[PDB]
Enzyme design. Structure first.
Site, mmCIF file in Angstrom:
data_model
loop_
_atom_site.group_PDB
_atom_site.id
_atom_site.type_symbol
_atom_site.label_atom_id
_atom_site.label_comp_id
_atom_site.label_asym_id
_atom_site.label_seq_id
_atom_site.Cartn_x
_atom_site.Cartn_y
_atom_site.Cartn_z
ATOM 1 N N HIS A 41 58.375 -8.312 2.289
ATOM 2 C CA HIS A 41 58.821 -8.964 3.693
ATOM 3 C C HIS A 41 59.096 -8.245 4.554
ATOM 4 O O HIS A 41 59.319 -8.625 6.020
ATOM 5 C CB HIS A 41 60.245 -9.759 3.206
ATOM 6 C CG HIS A 41 61.363 -8.954 3.203
ATOM 7 N ND1 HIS A 41 61.879 -8.464 2.061
ATOM 8 C CD2 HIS A 41 62.396 -8.455 4.150
ATOM 9 C CE1 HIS A 41 62.986 -7.894 2.183
ATOM 10 N NE2 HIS A 41 63.397 -7.719 3.333
ATOM 11 N N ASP A 86 58.626 -9.124 -4.507
ATOM 12 C CA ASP A 86 58.748 -8.707 -3.259
ATOM 13 C C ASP A 86 58.717 -7.145 -3.055
ATOM 14 O O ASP A 86 59.508 -6.479 -3.136
ATOM 15 C CB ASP A 86 60.247 -8.960 -2.561
ATOM 16 C CG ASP A 86 60.438 -8.754 -1.326
ATOM 17 O OD1 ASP A 86 59.395 -8.506 -0.339
ATOM 18 O OD2 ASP A 86 61.566 -8.923 -0.863
ATOM 19 N N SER A 177 66.804 -3.373 3.360
ATOM 20 C CA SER A 177 65.678 -4.026 2.730
ATOM 21 C C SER A 177 64.724 -2.938 2.524
ATOM 22 O O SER A 177 64.458 -2.226 3.636
ATOM 23 C CB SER A 177 64.882 -5.193 3.551
ATOM 24 O OG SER A 177 65.666 -6.265 3.347
#
Ligand SMILES: [Cl-]
Ligand SMILES: [Cl-]
Lengths: 223, 166
Positions: A41, A86, A177
Protein backbone atom coordinates in the site's frame (compact mmCIF):
# COMPACT_ATOMS: atom_id res chain seq x y z
CA UNK A 1 4.33 3.93 17.75
CA UNK A 2 1.90 4.10 20.78
CA UNK A 3 3.36 3.85 24.34
CA UNK A 4 6.89 3.09 23.13
CA UNK A 5 10.10 4.94 23.72
CA UNK A 6 13.01 6.25 21.73
CA UNK A 7 14.90 3.30 20.22
CA UNK A 8 18.48 2.84 21.41
CA UNK A 9 20.18 4.81 18.53
CA UNK A 10 20.97 2.57 15.48
CA UNK A 11 19.66 -0.57 17.28
CA UNK A 12 17.36 -1.27 14.27
CA UNK A 13 19.90 -0.77 11.44
CA UNK A 14 17.63 -2.41 8.85
CA UNK A 15 15.03 0.38 9.28
CA UNK A 16 14.32 2.35 6.07
CA UNK A 17 12.49 5.70 5.89
CA UNK A 18 10.39 6.27 2.73
CA UNK A 19 10.16 10.07 2.25
CA UNK A 20 8.06 12.21 -0.17
CA UNK A 21 9.10 15.91 -0.50
CA UNK A 22 11.28 15.57 2.68
CA UNK A 23 8.38 14.04 4.77
CA UNK A 24 8.10 10.47 5.97
CA UNK A 25 5.05 8.54 4.71
CA UNK A 26 6.07 4.85 5.31
CA UNK A 27 8.97 2.71 6.55
CA UNK A 28 10.61 -0.34 5.05
CA UNK A 29 13.20 -2.93 5.97
CA UNK A 30 16.59 -3.60 4.36
CA UNK A 31 16.61 -7.33 3.48
CA UNK A 32 19.55 -7.32 0.99
CA UNK A 33 22.14 -4.63 0.17
CA UNK A 34 20.07 -3.63 -2.91
CA UNK A 35 16.47 -4.39 -1.67
CA UNK A 36 14.01 -2.81 0.75
CA UNK A 37 10.82 -4.67 1.75
CA UNK A 38 7.76 -2.53 2.52
CA UNK A 39 3.97 -2.71 2.48
CA UNK A 40 2.45 -2.79 -1.04
CA UNK A 41 0.00 0.00 0.00
CA UNK A 42 3.13 2.29 0.23
CA UNK A 43 3.81 1.87 -3.58
CA UNK A 44 5.09 4.92 -5.48
CA UNK A 45 6.57 5.22 -9.00
CA UNK A 46 9.90 6.25 -7.39
CA UNK A 47 11.35 6.58 -3.90
CA UNK A 48 13.76 8.51 -1.74
CA UNK A 49 14.92 6.12 1.02
CA UNK A 50 16.75 7.05 4.22
CA UNK A 51 19.08 4.42 5.68
CA UNK A 52 21.09 4.68 8.91
CA UNK A 53 18.71 7.22 10.46
CA UNK A 54 17.59 7.92 14.05
CA UNK A 55 16.37 11.44 13.68
CA UNK A 56 15.00 12.03 10.14
CA UNK A 57 17.61 14.82 9.45
CA UNK A 58 20.29 13.03 7.33
CA UNK A 59 22.52 16.16 7.64
CA UNK A 60 22.66 15.45 11.43
CA UNK A 61 23.16 11.64 11.08
CA UNK A 62 26.75 10.47 10.48
CA UNK A 63 26.78 7.14 8.57
CA UNK A 64 23.33 7.78 7.00
CA UNK A 65 22.54 7.49 3.30
CA UNK A 66 19.64 8.99 1.29
CA UNK A 67 19.27 6.72 -1.76
CA UNK A 68 17.04 6.68 -4.84
CA UNK A 69 14.94 3.78 -6.13
CA UNK A 70 12.77 3.54 -9.33
CA UNK A 71 11.79 -0.17 -9.48
CA UNK A 72 9.35 -1.85 -7.10
CA UNK A 73 7.48 -5.15 -7.35
CA UNK A 74 4.15 -5.51 -5.43
CA UNK A 75 3.15 -9.07 -4.54
CA UNK A 76 1.01 -10.29 -7.47
CA UNK A 77 -1.95 -11.12 -5.19
CA UNK A 78 -1.83 -7.84 -3.24
CA UNK A 79 -5.35 -6.76 -2.24
CA UNK A 80 -7.07 -10.04 -3.26
CA UNK A 81 -8.72 -10.55 -0.83
CA UNK A 82 -8.90 -6.87 0.27
CA UNK A 83 -5.93 -5.79 2.44
CA UNK A 84 -4.18 -9.18 1.96
CA UNK A 85 -0.72 -10.01 0.62
CA UNK A 86 0.50 -6.53 1.67
CA UNK A 87 4.18 -6.57 0.67
CA UNK A 88 6.42 -5.14 -2.03
CA UNK A 89 10.13 -5.19 -2.87
CA UNK A 90 11.96 -1.96 -3.80
CA UNK A 91 15.20 -2.31 -5.75
CA UNK A 92 17.69 0.42 -4.82
CA UNK A 93 19.40 2.09 -7.81
CA UNK A 94 22.77 0.90 -6.31
CA UNK A 95 23.78 -1.69 -3.68
CA UNK A 96 24.58 -0.05 -0.28
CA UNK A 97 27.79 -0.76 1.67
CA UNK A 98 26.56 -2.26 4.94
CA UNK A 99 27.99 -0.89 8.19
CA UNK A 100 27.08 -1.06 11.89
CA UNK A 101 24.26 1.50 11.19
CA UNK A 102 22.99 0.15 7.80
CA UNK A 103 22.52 -3.65 7.84
CA UNK A 104 20.10 -6.21 6.38
CA UNK A 105 17.99 -8.53 8.53
CA UNK A 106 17.06 -12.19 7.92
CA UNK A 107 13.38 -13.05 7.43
CA UNK A 108 11.70 -15.67 9.67
CA UNK A 109 11.02 -19.01 7.95
CA UNK A 110 8.71 -20.15 10.75
CA UNK A 111 5.15 -18.83 11.39
CA UNK A 112 4.48 -16.47 14.31
CA UNK A 113 4.05 -18.07 17.73
CA UNK A 114 0.94 -17.06 19.65
CA UNK A 115 1.89 -15.19 22.84
CA UNK A 116 5.46 -14.33 21.80
CA UNK A 117 6.67 -10.78 22.57
CA UNK A 118 8.06 -8.96 19.50
CA UNK A 119 9.44 -5.48 18.75
CA UNK A 120 7.95 -2.92 16.31
CA UNK A 121 9.78 0.29 15.33
CA UNK A 122 8.80 3.41 13.44
CA UNK A 123 8.42 7.15 13.09
CA UNK A 124 4.62 7.19 13.07
CA UNK A 125 2.19 8.94 15.43
CA UNK A 126 2.60 8.87 19.23
CA UNK A 127 -0.22 8.52 21.79
CA UNK A 128 -0.41 12.39 21.84
CA UNK A 129 -1.11 12.58 18.04
CA UNK A 130 2.27 14.17 17.32
CA UNK A 131 5.14 12.79 15.20
CA UNK A 132 8.33 11.80 17.06
CA UNK A 133 11.72 13.38 16.29
CA UNK A 134 13.56 9.99 16.60
CA UNK A 135 12.78 6.35 15.82
CA UNK A 136 10.47 4.73 18.41
CA UNK A 137 10.43 1.08 19.60
CA UNK A 138 7.69 -0.87 21.43
CA UNK A 139 6.96 -4.48 22.33
CA UNK A 140 3.71 -6.15 21.20
CA UNK A 141 2.72 -9.78 21.64
CA UNK A 142 1.43 -12.10 18.90
CA UNK A 143 -2.30 -13.05 19.22
CA UNK A 144 -3.66 -16.48 18.23
CA UNK A 145 -5.11 -17.03 14.75
CA UNK A 146 -8.45 -17.84 16.52
CA UNK A 147 -8.54 -14.37 18.15
CA UNK A 148 -7.29 -12.56 14.97
CA UNK A 149 -10.05 -14.20 12.83
CA UNK A 150 -12.77 -13.51 15.43
CA UNK A 151 -11.87 -9.79 15.48
CA UNK A 152 -11.13 -9.28 11.74
CA UNK A 153 -13.24 -11.74 9.70
CA UNK A 154 -14.28 -11.26 6.95
CA UNK A 155 -10.96 -9.50 6.24
CA UNK A 156 -8.59 -11.90 8.10
CA UNK A 157 -6.34 -13.86 5.66
CA UNK A 158 -3.28 -16.01 6.57
CA UNK A 159 -1.03 -13.47 4.80
CA UNK A 160 -1.77 -11.49 8.02
CA UNK A 161 -1.17 -11.93 11.74
CA UNK A 162 -2.22 -9.85 14.76
CA UNK A 163 -0.06 -8.49 17.60
CA UNK A 164 -0.86 -6.22 20.53
CA UNK A 165 -4.19 -5.36 22.14
CA UNK A 166 -2.72 -5.50 25.67
CA UNK A 167 -3.84 -3.53 28.78
CA UNK A 168 -0.50 -1.70 28.12
CA UNK A 169 -2.07 0.04 25.03
CA UNK A 170 1.16 -0.64 23.02
CA UNK A 171 0.57 -0.53 19.21
CA UNK A 172 1.77 0.73 15.84
CA UNK A 173 0.03 3.83 14.37
CA UNK A 174 -0.26 5.98 11.21
CA UNK A 175 3.16 6.50 9.53
CA UNK A 176 4.45 3.13 10.86
CA UNK A 177 3.21 1.22 7.71
CA UNK A 178 5.89 -0.95 6.08
CA UNK A 179 8.19 -0.95 9.12
CA UNK A 180 9.45 -4.10 10.91
CA UNK A 181 8.07 -6.45 13.49
CA UNK A 182 11.00 -8.47 14.85
CA UNK A 183 10.47 -11.77 16.73
CA UNK A 184 13.25 -13.80 18.39
CA UNK A 185 16.00 -12.10 16.18
CA UNK A 186 14.24 -12.32 12.80
CA UNK A 187 11.96 -10.15 10.65
CA UNK A 188 8.51 -11.63 11.23
CA UNK A 189 6.12 -8.96 9.95
CA UNK A 190 5.49 -5.57 8.40
CA UNK A 191 3.14 -2.98 9.86
CA UNK A 192 -0.01 -3.16 7.68
CA UNK A 193 -3.37 -2.00 9.13
CA UNK A 194 -5.54 -1.78 12.22
CA UNK A 195 -8.18 0.34 14.03
CA UNK A 196 -8.01 4.10 15.00
CA UNK A 197 -7.60 5.27 17.62
CA UNK A 198 -4.53 3.01 17.91
CA UNK A 199 -3.70 1.28 21.24
CA UNK A 200 -7.23 0.18 22.09
CA UNK A 201 -7.30 -2.54 24.75
CA UNK A 202 -8.40 -5.86 23.12
CA UNK A 203 -7.68 -4.53 19.57
CA UNK A 204 -4.40 -5.83 18.12
CA UNK A 205 -2.86 -4.39 15.01
CA UNK A 206 -2.41 -6.39 11.81
CA UNK A 207 0.97 -7.25 10.27
CA UNK A 208 2.04 -8.85 6.96
CA UNK A 209 2.87 -12.53 7.66
CA UNK A 210 6.26 -12.70 5.96
CA UNK A 211 6.82 -16.44 6.66
CA UNK A 212 4.25 -17.04 3.84
CA UNK A 213 6.37 -15.16 1.25
CA UNK A 214 10.01 -16.28 1.77
CA UNK A 215 10.03 -18.11 -1.68
CA UNK A 216 8.52 -15.08 -3.56
CA UNK A 217 10.99 -12.71 -1.82
CA UNK A 218 14.04 -14.94 -2.60
CA UNK A 219 12.94 -15.44 -6.29
CA UNK A 220 12.24 -11.68 -6.84
CA UNK A 221 15.65 -10.67 -5.37
CA UNK A 222 17.49 -13.39 -7.44
CA UNK A 223 15.63 -12.42 -10.73
CA UNK B 1 -2.06 3.00 -7.45
CA UNK B 2 0.70 5.70 -7.19
CA UNK B 3 -1.72 8.73 -7.14
CA UNK B 4 -1.85 10.61 -3.80
CA UNK B 5 -4.93 12.73 -3.09
CA UNK B 6 -3.90 16.38 -2.45
CA UNK B 7 -5.58 19.47 -0.99
CA UNK B 8 -5.85 22.94 -2.57
CA UNK B 9 -2.30 23.78 -1.23
CA UNK B 10 -0.91 20.68 -3.04
CA UNK B 11 -0.29 18.86 0.32
CA UNK B 12 -1.28 15.19 0.78
CA UNK B 13 -4.70 14.68 2.40
CA UNK B 14 -4.21 13.08 5.86
CA UNK B 15 -5.59 9.68 6.91
CA UNK B 16 -8.20 10.82 9.49
CA UNK B 17 -6.10 13.32 11.45
CA UNK B 18 -7.15 16.51 9.65
CA UNK B 19 -10.55 17.71 8.38
CA UNK B 20 -11.21 19.12 4.89
CA UNK B 21 -14.00 20.87 3.01
CA UNK B 22 -15.28 19.31 -0.21
CA UNK B 23 -15.56 22.51 -2.24
CA UNK B 24 -17.47 22.01 -5.51
CA UNK B 25 -15.40 23.34 -8.42
CA UNK B 26 -18.30 25.18 -10.00
CA UNK B 27 -20.45 25.62 -6.83
CA UNK B 28 -17.95 27.23 -4.38
CA UNK B 29 -20.89 29.36 -3.13
CA UNK B 30 -22.49 26.14 -1.72
CA UNK B 31 -21.37 23.58 0.84
CA UNK B 32 -22.25 20.23 2.38
CA UNK B 33 -25.03 20.12 4.96
CA UNK B 34 -27.54 17.67 6.40
CA UNK B 35 -31.21 17.71 5.33
CA UNK B 36 -34.39 15.65 5.75
CA UNK B 37 -35.33 12.98 3.13
CA UNK B 38 -38.57 11.02 2.81
CA UNK B 39 -40.74 11.18 5.99
CA UNK B 40 -37.73 11.30 8.38
CA UNK B 41 -37.96 13.77 11.30
CA UNK B 42 -34.12 14.07 11.73
CA UNK B 43 -31.86 15.39 8.93
CA UNK B 44 -29.69 12.44 7.82
CA UNK B 45 -29.22 13.11 4.06
CA UNK B 46 -26.18 14.97 2.67
CA UNK B 47 -27.03 17.99 0.42
CA UNK B 48 -25.15 20.80 -1.23
CA UNK B 49 -26.71 23.85 0.44
CA UNK B 50 -26.34 27.30 -1.24
CA UNK B 51 -26.67 28.93 2.26
CA UNK B 52 -23.50 27.30 3.74
CA UNK B 53 -19.99 27.89 2.41
CA UNK B 54 -17.65 26.10 2.86
CA UNK B 55 -20.06 23.69 4.63
CA UNK B 56 -19.45 20.77 6.98
CA UNK B 57 -15.87 19.47 6.96
CA UNK B 58 -15.07 15.77 6.44
CA UNK B 59 -12.33 13.34 7.38
CA UNK B 60 -11.12 10.51 5.11
CA UNK B 61 -10.20 7.27 6.89
CA UNK B 62 -8.38 4.10 5.82
CA UNK B 63 -7.33 1.31 8.22
CA UNK B 64 -3.91 1.23 6.59
CA UNK B 65 -1.21 2.55 8.97
CA UNK B 66 -0.16 5.28 6.52
CA UNK B 67 -0.58 9.03 7.07
CA UNK B 68 -1.71 9.88 3.48
CA UNK B 69 -4.62 8.88 1.20
CA UNK B 70 -4.27 7.38 -2.29
CA UNK B 71 -7.00 7.37 -5.00
CA UNK B 72 -6.86 3.51 -4.86
CA UNK B 73 -7.77 3.26 -1.15
CA UNK B 74 -11.24 2.32 0.10
CA UNK B 75 -12.28 5.06 2.52
CA UNK B 76 -14.79 5.98 5.14
CA UNK B 77 -15.91 9.62 4.89
CA UNK B 78 -17.29 11.25 8.04
CA UNK B 79 -18.42 14.55 9.49
CA UNK B 80 -17.34 15.54 13.00
CA UNK B 81 -14.21 14.98 15.05
CA UNK B 82 -11.85 11.95 14.73
CA UNK B 83 -13.18 10.69 18.15
CA UNK B 84 -16.84 10.49 16.80
CA UNK B 85 -18.39 7.85 14.52
CA UNK B 86 -21.89 9.54 14.59
CA UNK B 87 -21.28 11.28 11.15
CA UNK B 88 -20.18 8.34 8.93
CA UNK B 89 -21.34 8.37 5.30
CA UNK B 90 -23.22 5.50 3.71
CA UNK B 91 -25.35 5.13 0.53
CA UNK B 92 -28.99 4.08 1.15
CA UNK B 93 -31.87 3.49 -1.28
CA UNK B 94 -34.48 6.16 -0.67
CA UNK B 95 -37.32 7.07 -3.09
CA UNK B 96 -37.52 9.34 -4.87
CA UNK B 97 -33.81 10.35 -4.63
CA UNK B 98 -32.36 6.92 -5.50
CA UNK B 99 -29.10 5.78 -3.85
CA UNK B 100 -28.73 8.74 -1.41
CA UNK B 101 -25.68 9.65 0.68
CA UNK B 102 -26.76 9.54 4.31
CA UNK B 103 -25.10 9.67 7.73
CA UNK B 104 -24.82 6.50 10.01
CA UNK B 105 -23.39 6.08 13.61
CA UNK B 106 -21.79 2.72 12.56
CA UNK B 107 -18.70 2.19 10.48
CA UNK B 108 -17.06 -0.75 8.72
CA UNK B 109 -13.26 -1.26 9.06
CA UNK B 110 -13.08 -0.57 5.32
CA UNK B 111 -15.45 2.01 3.87
CA UNK B 112 -17.06 1.93 0.44
CA UNK B 113 -15.81 5.18 -1.11
CA UNK B 114 -12.84 6.22 -3.21
CA UNK B 115 -11.66 9.74 -4.13
CA UNK B 116 -10.72 9.72 -7.83
CA UNK B 117 -9.21 12.41 -10.09
CA UNK B 118 -11.84 14.07 -12.33
CA UNK B 119 -11.36 17.21 -14.39
CA UNK B 120 -9.84 20.05 -12.27
CA UNK B 121 -10.48 18.11 -9.02
CA UNK B 122 -11.85 14.86 -7.55
CA UNK B 123 -15.06 12.90 -7.55
CA UNK B 124 -16.43 10.62 -4.83
CA UNK B 125 -17.13 7.09 -6.10
CA UNK B 126 -19.26 4.54 -4.24
CA UNK B 127 -18.40 0.84 -4.59
CA UNK B 128 -21.33 -1.35 -3.57
CA UNK B 129 -19.96 -4.28 -1.54
CA UNK B 130 -16.40 -2.97 -2.05
CA UNK B 131 -16.26 -4.63 -5.47
CA UNK B 132 -14.77 -3.53 -8.77
CA UNK B 133 -17.59 -1.35 -10.11
CA UNK B 134 -17.85 2.18 -8.84
CA UNK B 135 -20.84 4.56 -9.08
CA UNK B 136 -20.19 8.31 -9.27
CA UNK B 137 -21.73 10.57 -6.59
CA UNK B 138 -23.58 13.53 -8.13
CA UNK B 139 -26.56 15.77 -7.37
CA UNK B 140 -30.27 14.92 -7.44
CA UNK B 141 -32.67 17.88 -7.22
CA UNK B 142 -35.81 17.02 -5.21
CA UNK B 143 -37.94 19.05 -2.67
CA UNK B 144 -35.93 22.26 -3.44
CA UNK B 145 -32.66 20.55 -2.32
CA UNK B 146 -29.61 19.17 -4.10
CA UNK B 147 -29.01 15.73 -2.59
CA UNK B 148 -25.68 13.90 -2.94
CA UNK B 149 -26.66 10.63 -4.57
CA UNK B 150 -25.50 8.08 -7.17
CA UNK B 151 -25.58 9.70 -10.62
CA UNK B 152 -23.21 7.53 -12.62
CA UNK B 153 -21.39 9.49 -15.35
CA UNK B 154 -22.49 12.87 -13.85
CA UNK B 155 -20.22 13.33 -10.82
CA UNK B 156 -20.09 16.41 -8.59
CA UNK B 157 -16.42 17.54 -8.91
CA UNK B 158 -14.72 18.86 -5.76
CA UNK B 159 -11.46 20.36 -4.64
CA UNK B 160 -10.32 19.50 -1.10
CA UNK B 161 -9.57 22.47 1.22
CA UNK B 162 -7.86 21.83 4.61
CA UNK B 163 -10.16 23.11 7.42
CA UNK B 164 -7.60 25.33 9.19
CA UNK B 165 -10.24 28.13 9.54
CA UNK B 166 -11.47 26.22 12.67
CL1 LIG C 1 -8.64 27.30 -2.53
CL1 LIG D 1 -41.46 5.68 3.41
Amino acid sequence: IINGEDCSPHSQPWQAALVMENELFCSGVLVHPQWVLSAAHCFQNSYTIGLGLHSLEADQEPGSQMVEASLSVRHPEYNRPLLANDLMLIKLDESVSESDTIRSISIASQCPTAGNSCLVSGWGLLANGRMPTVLQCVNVSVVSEEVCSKLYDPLYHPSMFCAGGGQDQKDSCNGDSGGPLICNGYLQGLVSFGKAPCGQVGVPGVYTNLCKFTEWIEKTVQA
Amino acid sequence: GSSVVVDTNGQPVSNGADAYYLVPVSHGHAGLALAKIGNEAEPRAVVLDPHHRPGLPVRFESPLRINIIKESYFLNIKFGPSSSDSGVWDVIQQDPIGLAVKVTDTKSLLGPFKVEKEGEGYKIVYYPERGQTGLDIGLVHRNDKYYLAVKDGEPCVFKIRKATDE
